[PDB]
Amino acid sequence: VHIPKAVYKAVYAHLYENASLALKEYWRVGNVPGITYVDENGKLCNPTYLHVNCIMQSLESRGVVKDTFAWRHHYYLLTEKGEQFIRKELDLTDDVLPTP
Amino acid sequence: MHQKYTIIVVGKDLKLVERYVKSIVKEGRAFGISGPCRAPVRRLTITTRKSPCGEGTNTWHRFELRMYKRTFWVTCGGNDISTILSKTVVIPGIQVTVEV
Amino acid sequence: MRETEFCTHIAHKRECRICGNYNSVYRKYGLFICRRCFKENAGKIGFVKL
Amino acid sequence: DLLERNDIEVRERDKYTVHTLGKKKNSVAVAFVKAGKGDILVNNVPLALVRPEILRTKVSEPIMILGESLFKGLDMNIKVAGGGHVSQIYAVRQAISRGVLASVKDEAARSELRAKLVSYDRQLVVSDPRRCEAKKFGGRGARARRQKSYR
Amino acid sequence: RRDEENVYYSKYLNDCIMEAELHEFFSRELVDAGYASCSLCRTIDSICVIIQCAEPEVVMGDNHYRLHKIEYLLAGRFMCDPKNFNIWVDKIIKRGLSAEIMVDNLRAKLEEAMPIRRAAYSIIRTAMRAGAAGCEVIVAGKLRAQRARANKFKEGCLISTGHPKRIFLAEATRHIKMRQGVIGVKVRIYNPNIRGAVMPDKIEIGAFS
Amino acid sequence: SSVTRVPADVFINSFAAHLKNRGIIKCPAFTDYVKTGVSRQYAPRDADWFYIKAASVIRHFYISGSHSIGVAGLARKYSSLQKGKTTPHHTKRASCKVIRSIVSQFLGQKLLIAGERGRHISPNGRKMVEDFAEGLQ
RNA sequence: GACGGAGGGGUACCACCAGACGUGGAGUCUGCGGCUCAAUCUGACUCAACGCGCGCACCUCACCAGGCCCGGACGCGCGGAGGACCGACAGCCGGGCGCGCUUUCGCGAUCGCGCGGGUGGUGGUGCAUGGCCGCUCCCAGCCCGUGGCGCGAGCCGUCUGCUCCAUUGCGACAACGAGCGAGACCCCGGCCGCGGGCGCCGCGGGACGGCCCGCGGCAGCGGGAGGACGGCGGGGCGAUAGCAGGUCUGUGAUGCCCUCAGACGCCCUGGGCCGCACGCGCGCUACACUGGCGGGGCCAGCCGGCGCCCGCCAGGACGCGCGGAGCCCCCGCCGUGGCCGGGACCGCGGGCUGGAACGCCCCCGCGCACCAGGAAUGUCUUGUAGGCGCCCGCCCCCACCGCG
C-alpha cells in the first residue's frame, strides 16, 4: 500500500527516541500501538497492522534494524547505520540524542 | 493515623511468600500490623497428554502452579505503611499490592 | 476491493502466545498457551509436576 | 462444607465446657457439649429421632452402652458437616462416645467404662483411617483400568 | 464471608507468563551474555528486571546504551511502564558450574567446526576445573553419518533420578544447525555442594567426639 | 427447635390440611396441568400436590429463618434426576413458576417479608408455622 | 547375545487361585476398516492403531466447487511528475467483488521493468533430523579405576549359599575399592503440637520391623501386639542399552526436493471431514418388583455467587452480592404384562447460542430392538471393585468422551 509519510515518520520517531520497535500478528487490536500518527484533519490514529510490518521488513533489509523473533513478536533494535538513516529522514543533527 | 489499608502478598513459592510475611511481622511492630491471613491456595492446574503425538498409551502430565496469597490490614497513615513495605526484606518474584 | 474483503471477521483467532498454533490453544486460565508448547515452557512459568 | 472456619458459632460458650471431634471419611462431627438436662440435639435435631430409620438405632448405640444415666445430665449441640448420611451417623457416634468420657473425669471407673464401650464397638473412639482413594489415568477408578481392546 | 473473584493471582499469572517471554527473548538475543535466569522486581509498577548472565559487558558498557535499548524494547513490547522497566544486569560466577553458559559455548564451538570429541571434553574439563562433581554431554543427530547417531561424552558421577536431581542437577539443551541439519547439544551437571541443600541419601559422620 | 421435634414429614402433611381447612394459600387450580418441574415424566397424581408443596415450602422458609430464600433456590431443594435418554441421568431442579406462585401467596398472608436478596419468613408467619408444629405433636 | 515344547530358583489380578463386575448379544454414541463421492484433509494397525493426535454450522482446515489480490523485500541496469505507482459514481456481467467491462474521474513517488536474490507453503519424507514422547521395562539391572585370567572375542569384581517388593541385604569369594538405577527424595493424606485466621492455613513431631514371643551365622522372617496410623497409604521422579515406534499437521524446530503471482502465499463464499450394502474397537442406556413412577425428607468433595418477575418448559428481561448433588431414607401407586420394563427414530410445536443449523434445549405425540447375550476375552483386592451423582478440559452452541 502507499504507506503514509505520517505513519513512516512515527515509526522512525519511536525508533530514534526509544531505540526499539516491536510487532504482533496481522489481526488488528485498534491497529499498531506505540505509533500515533495524525492526518491533518485526522484524529490521533494508529497505523494499520499491515503498514508497520512492510516498512520494518524493508528497513531490516536496508540495515536500519536488527530483529529477534520471540513468542510471535518482532524485537527490532536500532543499528548505528540506522541512526544515520532515521536522522537524515528526520533531518536531525548528530547532537540530537535517543533516550539512552 | 487510623486509615485502614488492605495489602495482598502473592508468591509462586510458599517459602518466598513466607519470607515477606516474616519480614512484615518484624517491621509491623512499629506501625501495629495485623496478624497474617493465609488464603486457600488457588491453583492453576494443567493436565496435558505428555505425548506430542497420539502414538502410545494415552498418558497424562499433571502440572500445578498453586498461587499463595497473604492478607494484611493496617489502620495506619500512608507514609507509615510505605515505611513498613520499603523497610521489610524484598525477594524477587514476590508481589505486594495495597488497596484503600 | 481486496482491501474491502481481506480478513473480514469470520471467527475468533486464538493462537498459543509462544508458538502461534490455532489447535489446542488452551483458555483454562489467562494462559493462551499451546498444549504441546506448554510442556516446553511450563518450567519458566513454574508449573511443576506433583 | 466440612471443617468450616468457625468450629461452632450458632452456639458459643454458654456452659459448653466439653468439646469433642468425631471423624468418618470427610464427616466431621464438631461437638459442643455442656452439662445439661441429658437430652442432645445433632444439627439442631433431636438425637433420639433422625431421618433414616435403620441408622437411628446405630446413632443411639454408644448412648446405652456408656451408661444412659451417665449421659443424662449432659446436653450436646454437635454439628456434622460434609461426609454422607452413613458417614455422618458414625462420626456423631464417635463424638458422643468421646464426649461423655472427657466430662466424666479420668479415674478407674471412667477407664472401666471406656474399656467396656471400645470393646463392644471397635473404632468407636478411633477415627476411621480409611480415606477415599484417588482415580489415576488408567481408567475410571483408583484401581480399575479401561478394557484392553487388542489384549 | 468473602467474594471469590480475587483478580490478585490473575495479575500474578500475567507477571509469570511475562517472565517466560522475557527469558525466550533474552536467550536468543543475549547469546554473548550467555543469559541464564530472569525475573521482575515489579514493585508498585517498577519493573526492575533481575537478570543473572555470564557477561553483561557485550550488551552493557557500550555507553550503557544497548542495555537501555533493550529496556525500552521490553517496556514498549509489553506496552507497560517506561522508565520503571529498568533491566539490572549481573555477572555469573563459576560459569563452569552453570549449565547454560557451558551449553552456549558448546553450540558455538561445534558450529565453528571444533571436533566433537575435544569440544565435549573441553566443557567436561570446565566442570572438573570448577570442581563440579560430574558433567555429561549428549550431542545427538546426523553426526557424521546419513543415519542419526548419538555421541555421549561424560566424566565423573551423575545422579539420574529422584526429587534431588531437580534441585541438584543443571540441564541445558541447544539446537545446533550445521550444514547437515539440526543437531542437539545437551549438558547435565550435578553438584552435591551447591546452595544450602544436602543430597538426602548421605549421612555425614566425621569425628569420634 | 420444636419444628425439629415434630417429625417434619408429619408436619408437612398436616400443614397442607391446615392450609385447606383454614383457607391459607388457596391452590391456584392452574396448577392442574403443570408437572413439578422438567425432571418429572409422569406429572403429580396426588391431586393435593400444591397444598403438599406449599406446606413444606413455608416450613423450609421457617427452617432457613433469617438466611433468606429465592424462587430458583427453592427449586434446587426439590431437584430430581432426569431420565429417558441414552445419555446418563443428570439432576434437574424444578420449574420456577409453581414455586414463585407459592411464595407470592405467603407474602399476602403475612408469612413472608422481603429481606436482602431473597424473601425470609415474616414474624407473624414464624409464630403460626411453629405454633402448628407444637400443636400437632 | 537371541531362543528351547531344556532343567533350577523365583515373581506379578498388565498372571492365574477363590471370587467379583463385565464386555462380546440389542438399540444408540464415538473412533476405525470398507466404500460412496465435487470434496469425504489426514496420521496411526498385536501388545505399544482403533472418545487416539483436548468438542468439525463458519473459522479451524490441511480438502473441494468457484473466485480476490501481494504480503517478489532489499540491491544493479532500464523506463517514469502531468504523471511511476493507483482507486472509482451509474449501467452491465456476476452469491458477491471497479472481478471484469462500457464509461471518465481521481491518485501522487509511497515506484514499475527485468535481474541478483528473497519470502511464505498444515506440500512430501519422522527411512535425512533436533526436540518431545511411546515401548522394551509396573524390569532390576547398568557400568568404572587398578589388579588377576586368556592369542583374542571376552571374563573377574557383577556370588550355582541364603533373604527382599527390589544387584534388598548378609556371610562369602582374584579380586579390591567406587558409582548409577531401587532406596532415599518430593507432593497429597490420616493423628499430635504451636503459630495464624478476609478463607481452618504456616512450620515442626510421630513410626522405627523400635518393642514382645519365637525361629534365625546373618539377612531377616512368622506370629503378638501396643499404638489415627505397620512392616509397600496413594501418587511424582523414574537406570543402562536401544527401537528405522510415532509426530516435518505444536515448534524464526529442521536437511533436502517440490509450489511460488492463475502460489501449496493469503483472503472471500458455499459445501466437506458428520455421506452409508457393510466388518470391527471404546463407551452409554436397557433388558424391570434388589424395579420403575408420584410425592416427602436430605448428604457431598474437586472447589464453586445470586435476587425479582414472565413463561408448560425452554428460555428471557429485570436487578444484585454472594451458594451446594445424586444414591439413600419415609409414604403412595403399579402387580409380572414388552406393562405403569425400556427409550429408538420420526410427526409437529415452543425456545436458545448464534451473520448464520446443517448444533443444542424443552413440551405434546410416537413407542425401536433387548425378557440377561454364542465362541471367545477384559478389568479387579479397603474405603477396594462396583453402584451413584458433580466438577473441569477442548467449548459460539454442544459429552454418552477424557481429566478428575
Q: Do D44 and F5 touch (CB under 8 A)?
A: no
| H or E segment to which residue B46 belongs | strand B42-49
In angstroms, the CA E101 to CA D147 distance is 49
Q: Which residues of B90-100 are buried (b: 16+ CB within 10 A; e: fewer)?
A: eebbbbbbeee
Q: Is the CB atom of residue B52 positioned under 7 angstroms from any atom of strand G?
A: yes
In angstroms, the CA D41 to CA D48 distance is 9
Residue carrying the nine cell digits 550503557: E64
In angstroms, the CA F6 to CA F2 distance is 6
Could you say which DSSP state residue C48 is in? E
Using a 7 Å cut-off to protein CB atoms, list the covered nucleotides of chain G. Answer: 14, 22-23, 27-29, 43-44, 46-50, 52-55, 58-61, 67-69, 71-75, 85-88, 96-99, 107-111, 122, 128-135, 179-191, 195-203, 228-229, 233-241, 244-247, 250-256, 266-269, 281-286, 292-301, 303-316, 320-330, 342-344, 355, 361-364, 377-386, 388-390, 392-396, 399-400, 402-404
The grid coordinates listed for A76 are: 527490532
The grid coordinates listed for F18 are: 391446615
Closest CA to A21 of A80, A76, A95: A76
How far apart are the two ends of chain D, measured CA to CA in Å? 44
In angstroms, the CA E17 to CA B67 distance is 14
SS3 string, chain D, reads CCCCCCCCCCCCCCCCCEEEEEECCCEEEEEEEECCCCCCEECCEECCCCCCCHHHHHHCHHHHHCCHHHHCCCEECCEEEECCHHHHHHHHHHHHHHHHHHHHCCCHHHHHHHHHHHHHCCCCCCCCCCCCCCCCCCCCCCCCCCCCCCC
Query: Which chain D residues have a beta carbon less than 8 Å from that of F7?
Result: 49
The grid coordinates listed for E36 are: 541464564
Contacts of F35 (CB under 8 A, 6+ apart): F41, F42, F43, F44
In angstroms, the CA C32 to CA C24 distance is 9
D3 and D28 Cβ atoms separated by less than 8 Å? yes
Q: Which chains touch A (3 or more CB pairs under 8 A)?
A: C, E
Bridge-partner residues for B6, per DSSP? B73, B99
**Tally of domains within chain B:** 1
Residue F59's SS3 state is helix
In angstroms, the CA A7 to CA D87 distance is 72
Amino acid letter, F76: R
Amino acid letter, B44: L
In angstroms, the CA A73 to CA A78 distance is 16
Q: Which of residues 189-208 of E touch strand G (CB under 7 A)?
A: 200-201
Could you say which DSSP state residue F87 is in? S
In a domain, A11, yes or no: yes
Q: Do D41 and F5 touch (CB under 8 A)?
A: no
Q: Is the CB atom of residue D105 positioned under 7 angstroms from any atom of strand G?
A: no
DSSP E16-55: HHHHHHHHHHHHHH-TTTTEEEEEE--BTTB--EEEEES-
Amino acid letter, E184: G
Rounded to 5 degrees, what angle do the CA atoms A82, E20, E33 make?
A: 50
Closest CA to D77 of D29, D22, D6: D29
How far apart are the two ends of chain E, measured CA to CA in Å? 58
CB-based contact (8 Å) between A29 and chain C? no
Residue E142: other Cβ atoms inside 10 A: 15
The grid coordinates listed for E203 are: 549421612
- Distances E96 to D5, E28, E138 between C-alpha atoms, Å: 52, 20, 17
In a domain, D1, yes or no: no
Residue carrying the nine cell digits 473404632: D123
Kind of pairing, strands B37-38 and B60-75?
antiparallel
Give nearest nucleotide to E190 (CA–C1'). G180
Residue E177's SS3 state is strand
In angstroms, the CA B8 to CA A31 distance is 35
- Distances F18 to B21, F45, F122 between C-alpha atoms, Å: 61, 21, 18
B16 and B94 Cβ atoms separated by less than 8 Å? yes
In a domain, D141, yes or no: yes
Residues in chain E: 209
In angstroms, the CA B81 to CA B98 distance is 9
Backbone φ and ψ for B45, nearest 5 degrees, come out as -115, 125
A57-64 contacts, C-beta under 8 A, 24 or more apart: A59/A85, A64/A15
B89 and B9 Cβ atoms separated by less than 8 Å? no
Contacts of B21 (CB under 8 A, 6+ apart): B9, B36, B70
Bridge-partner residues for E91, per DSSP? E53
Residue carrying the nine cell digits 511502564: E81
Contacts of E161 (CB under 8 A, 6+ apart): none
In angstroms, the CA A39 to CA A6 distance is 7
Rounded to the nearest angstrom, the minimum Cα separation between D137 and chain B is 7
Closest CA to E111 of E198, E179, E178, E187: E178
Residue of B nearest to C45 (CA): B65
Residue carrying the nine cell digits 561445534: E110
**Tally of domains within chain D:** 1
Rounded to the nearest angstrom, the minimum Cα separation between D45 and chain F is 5
Contacts of E125 (CB under 8 A, 6+ apart): E155
- Distances E169 to B34, B58, C47, F102 between C-alpha atoms, Å: 41, 29, 18, 69
D80 and D29 Cβ atoms separated by less than 8 Å? yes
Closest CA to B66 of C38, C48, E2: C48
SS3 string, chain A, reads CCCCHHHHHHHHHHHHHHCEECCCCCCCCCCCCCCCCECCCCCECCCCHHHHHHHHHHHHHHCCEECCCCCCCCCEEECHHHHHHHHHHCCCCCCCCCCC
Give nearest nucleotide to E166 (CA–C1'). G237
Q: How long is the CA D58 to C1' G354 vector, in angstroms?
A: 57
| H or E segment to which residue F58 belongs | helix F49-64
Rounded to the nearest angstrom, the minimum Cα separation between B7 and chain E is 11
Q: How long is the CA D88 to C1' G299 vector, in angstroms?
A: 8
Bridge-partner residues for B62, per DSSP? B47
Q: What is the CATH number of domain E99-190?
A: 3.30.1140.32
Rounded to the nearest angstrom, the minimum Cα separation between B85 and chain C is 26
Q: Do A71 and E76 touch (CB under 8 A)?
A: no
The grid coordinates listed for E92 are: 555469573
Q: Which of residues 19-48 of E touch strand G (CB under 7 A)?
A: 28
Residue carrying the nine cell digits 464427616: D27
Residue D51: other Cβ atoms inside 10 A: 11
Residue of E nearest to C47 (CA): E16
CB-based contact (8 Å) between E42 and chain B? yes
Sign of torsion over alpha carbons B73, B75, B81, B87: negative
Q: Which of residues 49-78 of A touch strand G (CB under 7 A)?
A: 50, 54, 57-58, 61-63, 67, 69, 72, 74
Breaks in chain F after residues, C-to-N cutoff 2.5 Å: none
In a domain, A7, yes or no: yes
In angstroms, the CA D59 to CA D47 distance is 7
In angstroms, the CA D64 to CA D50 distance is 17
CB-based contact (8 Å) between C7 and chain A? yes
Q: Which of residues 67-126 of F touch strand G (CB under 7 A)?
A: 68-73, 76-91, 93, 95-98, 100-101, 103-104, 116-119
Could you say which DSSP state residue F5 is in? T
A56 and A35 Cβ atoms separated by less than 8 Å? no
Residue of D nearest to B58 (CA): D137
In angstroms, the CA E19 to CA E25 distance is 10
Backbone φ and ψ for F119, nearest 5 degrees, come out as -75, 155
E156 and E134 Cβ atoms separated by less than 8 Å? yes
CB-based contact (8 Å) between C17 and chain E? yes
Q: How long is the CA E203 to C1' G237 vector, in angstroms?
A: 22
How far apart are the two ends of chain F, measured CA to CA in Å? 13
Residue of D nearest to B48 (CA): D137
Could you say which DSSP state residue E159 is in? -
Q: Which residues of D10-38 are buried (b: 16+ CB within 10 A; e: fewer)?
A: eeeeeebebebbbbbbbbbbbbbbbeeee
Q: How long is the CA F90 to C1' G281 vector, in angstroms?
A: 28
In angstroms, the CA A92 to CA A77 distance is 20
Query: Which chain C residues have a beta carbon less than 8 Å from that of A27?
Result: 7, 13
Closest CA to B34 of B21, B49, B46, B19: B21
Q: How was this structure determined?
A: cryo-EM
F111 and F57 Cβ atoms separated by less than 8 Å? no
* Domain of residue A59, residue span: 1-93
| H or E segment to which residue E12 belongs | helix E8-29
Backbone φ and ψ for D4, nearest 5 degrees, come out as -70, 160
Gyration radius of chain D over CA positions: 18
E8-91, which class in CATH? alpha beta
Domain ranges of chain E: 8-91, 99-190
